[PDB]
Design an enzyme around this catalytic site. Structure first.
Site, short mmCIF file in Angstrom:
data_model
loop_
_atom_site.label_atom_id
_atom_site.label_comp_id
_atom_site.label_asym_id
_atom_site.label_seq_id
_atom_site.Cartn_x
_atom_site.Cartn_y
_atom_site.Cartn_z
N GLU A 1 1.29 -0.98 0.02
CA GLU A 1 -0.11 -0.21 0.21
C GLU A 1 0.93 1.76 0.20
OE1 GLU A 1 -3.10 0.58 -0.48
OE2 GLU A 1 -4.44 -0.96 0.53
N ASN B 1 -1.10 5.07 -1.31
CA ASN B 1 -2.13 6.11 -1.00
C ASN B 1 -3.79 4.65 0.06
OD1 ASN B 1 -5.43 6.88 -1.12
ND2 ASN B 1 -4.24 8.75 -2.42
N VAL C 1 -6.70 4.57 -2.22
CA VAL C 1 -6.95 4.15 -3.79
C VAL C 1 -5.99 2.92 -4.46
CG1 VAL C 1 -5.71 4.97 -6.74
CG2 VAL C 1 -6.75 6.80 -4.70
N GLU D 1 -1.45 -4.16 -4.69
CA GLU D 1 -1.67 -4.35 -3.49
C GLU D 1 -2.11 -5.74 -3.40
OE1 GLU D 1 -3.36 -2.42 -4.98
OE2 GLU D 1 -3.75 -0.17 -3.90
N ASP E 1 3.62 -4.50 24.83
CA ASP E 1 2.38 -3.61 24.17
C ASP E 1 2.82 -4.27 22.24
OD1 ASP E 1 0.29 -2.35 22.53
OD2 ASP E 1 1.10 -0.67 22.66
N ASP F 1 7.42 13.06 15.43
CA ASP F 1 6.98 12.68 15.60
C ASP F 1 6.22 11.73 15.35
OD1 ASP F 1 5.48 12.96 18.81
OD2 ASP F 1 6.39 10.93 17.95
N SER F 2 6.03 11.05 15.37
CA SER F 2 4.29 9.38 14.97
C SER F 2 3.54 9.77 15.60
CB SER F 2 4.89 8.38 15.56
OG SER F 2 4.96 7.87 16.55
N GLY G 1 -3.33 6.59 14.64
CA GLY G 1 -3.51 5.79 13.20
C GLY G 1 -1.58 5.07 12.60
C1 LIG Z 1 -4.00 2.67 23.71
C2 LIG Z 1 -3.51 4.22 24.30
C3 LIG Z 1 -4.70 5.06 24.73
C4 LIG Z 1 -4.58 6.26 24.38
C5 LIG Z 1 -3.55 6.56 24.37
C6 LIG Z 1 -2.25 6.02 22.85
C7 LIG Z 1 -1.24 6.79 21.95
C8 LIG Z 1 -0.36 7.94 22.51
C9 LIG Z 1 0.54 7.85 21.16
C10 LIG Z 1 1.18 8.97 21.00
C11 LIG Z 1 2.09 8.75 20.10
C12 LIG Z 1 2.90 9.72 19.55
N1 LIG Z 1 2.88 10.91 19.75
N2 LIG Z 1 4.50 9.35 19.33
C13 LIG Z 1 2.05 7.66 18.83
C14 LIG Z 1 0.57 6.85 19.29
C15 LIG Z 1 -0.16 7.26 20.27
N3 LIG Z 1 -0.95 6.51 20.94
C16 LIG Z 1 -2.72 4.62 23.00
CA LIG Z 2 -3.69 1.69 -2.05
#
Ligand SMILES: Cc1cccc(-c2cc3cc(C(=N)N)ccc3[nH]2)c1
Ligand SMILES: [Ca+2]
Length: 223
Positions: A52, A54, A57, A62, A84, A171-172, A175
């Protein structure tokens, strides 16, 4: 991914999108039949989407494969997010190619200062919300455990590490969870948690994969 850049179609061949009618988490392909993601991404009815770019689309490279089994780590604690990590088995083996490839597991842990590649389809805004359609990338260094624990007193365990920039901006984010953190060609982390996104002195927290290689290998071999 906040403060990142557009990776480029299929530049991260091991990146997977977990779909339950919509993209909800990332994952990493470790071999033709298995994906590694975050335990907090657990859900029933998961379809793994490989090759993947996009996610809205159909571009031609894929592979959509339903999960046949999910295995959340035996010691996963949803309250603290310790351990986790989760494994997902594909109903049918994926067809590996240049755009769909596996990422190797580590043989040893990574040190602070090591640069890594974090990727995903998560929120790209630090304040507000905006979800990208194409895969986003971010280069970030592993931070010292002391700076990690100082940011989150009493919340960091030996199964977690921080990566990113204390100044903020990169930062990540929501999603991206369950997605890969690859360093020196090895899957060293899984997007797990943090505080907000790209905020000052609040780096991202990642599952320390090197602590789970034995469990991963033994579990895949027995399932
Ligand atoms: C299960 C659960 C409950 C409440 C918050 C989070 C979460 C914080 C967070 C923060 C980041 C980040 N800023 N790197 C990325 C993914 C993230 N997931 C997860
Ligand atoms: Ca796609």
């Amino acid at each position: 991914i906040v403060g990142g850049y557009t990776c480029g179609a299929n530049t991260v061949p091991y990146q997977v999108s977990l779909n339950s009618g919509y993209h909800f988490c990332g994952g990493s392909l470790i071999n033709s039949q298995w994906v590694v993601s975050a335990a907090h991404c657990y859900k029933s009815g998961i379809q793994v989407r490989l090759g993947e770019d996009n996610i809205n689309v159909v571009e031609g490279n894929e592979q959509f494969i339903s999960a046949s089994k999910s295995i959340v780590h035996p010691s996963y604690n949803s309250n603290t997010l310790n351990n986790d990590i989760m494994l997902i088995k594909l109903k049918s083996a994926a067809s590996l190619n240049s755009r769909v490839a596996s990422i190797s597991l580590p043989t040893s842990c990574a040190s602070a200062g090591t640069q890594c590649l974090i990727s995903g389809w998560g929120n790209t805004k630090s304040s507000g919300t905006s979800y990208p359609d194409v895969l986003k990338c971010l280069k970030a260094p592993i931070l010292s455990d002391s700076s990690c624990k100082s940011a989150y007193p009493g919340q960091i365990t030996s199964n977690m590490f921080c990566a990113g920039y204390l100044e903020g901006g990169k930062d990540s984010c929501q999603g991206d969870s369950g997605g890969p953190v690859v360093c020196s060609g090895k899957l060293q982390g899984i997007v797990s948690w943090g505080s907000g996104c790209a905020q000052k002195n609040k780096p991202g927290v990642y599952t320390k994969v090197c602590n789970y290689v034995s469990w991963i290998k033994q579990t895949i071999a027995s399932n």
